[PDB]
Curated annotation (Swiss-Prot):
It comes from the Eukaryota. The PAF1 complex is a multifunctional complex. Involved in transcription initiation via genetic interactions with TATA-binding proteins. Involved in elongation. It regulates 3'-end formation of snR47 by modulating the recruitment or stable association of NRD1 and NAB3 with RNA polymerase II. Also has a role in transcription-coupled histone modification. Required for activation of RAD6 ubiquitin conjugate and the BRE1 ubiquitin ligase which ubiquitinate 'Lys-126' histone H2B. It comes from Saccharomyces cerevisiae (strain ATCC 204508 / S288c) (Baker's yeast). Keywords: Activator, Nucleus, Phosphoprotein, Transcription, Transcription regulation. GO terms for biological process: mRNA 3'-end processing; negative regulation of DNA recombination; positive regulation of transcription elongation by RNA polymerase I; positive regulation of transcription elongation by RNA polymerase II; regulation of transcription-coupled nucleotide-excision repair; transcription elongation by RNA polymerase I; transcription elongation by RNA polymerase II. It is found in: Nucleus, Nucleoplasm. Its main location: nucleus. Component of the PAF1 complex which consists of at least CDC73, CTR9, LEO1, PAF1 and RTF1. Interacts with FACT subunits POB3 and SPT16. GO terms for molecular function: chromatin binding; RNA polymerase II C-terminal domain phosphoserine binding; RNA polymerase II complex binding. The chain holds residues 235 to 393 of 393 of the full protein. Belongs to the CDC73 family. This is Cell division control protein 73. GO terms for cellular component: Cdc73/Paf1 complex; euchromatin; nucleus.
Length: 159
């Protein structure tokens, strides 16, 4: 069966972008986007081996929907990373957070000590907290993220 899709934000300011996503999800290190080039094509592929899943899963990670040529591709979106700007969702199949996050699992990544915006608290999104100063804490954060996503994959039939 087909590769699952993760949608992430395009704004180069966003905590996580196509520039630092692989380092974060695979190497277990947050890297500030300013210290990296921009990635114009807004696409990266990654592969992940899960404890409870037999075969490695190949993820398509995109910060845009210009390649969503068929509406059926929206069935393959297993996660959405959000910064809390609804405009991110403007060109999505489901453009309101209420509808979108009933359809796809949402994640809100931010730093501890930074207030989560009013509207984000109301959203059906899982909040994930990074440490401002202790980069070693990323290891636990990333393990937790993959544990969470694994349950989502299993629920969607990826075993």
């Amino acid at each position: 069966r087909k590769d699952p899709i993760i949608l992430i934000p395009s704004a180069a300011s966003s905590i996580l972008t196509v520039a630092n996503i692989k380092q974060f999800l695979l190497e277990s290190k947050y890297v500030n986007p300013r210290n990296l080039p921009s990635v114009p094509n807004g696409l990266v592929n990654i592969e992940k081996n899960f404890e409870r899943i037999s075969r490695p899963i190949r993820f398509i990670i995109v910060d845009n929907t210009r390649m969503f040529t068929k509406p059926e591709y929206w069935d393959r979106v297993v996660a959405i990373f959000t910064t809390g700007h609804t405009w991110q969702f403007n060109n999505y199949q489901w453009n309101s957070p209420q509808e979108l996050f009933q359809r796809c699992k949402g994640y809100y990544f931010h730093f501890a000590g930074d207030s989560v915006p009013q509207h984000v608290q109301q959203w059906n999104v899982e909040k994930v907290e990074l440490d401002k100063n202790k980069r070693f804490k990323d290891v636990e954060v990333v393990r937790y993220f993959w544990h969470s996503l694994e349950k989502e994959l299993i629920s969607r039939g990826y075993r």
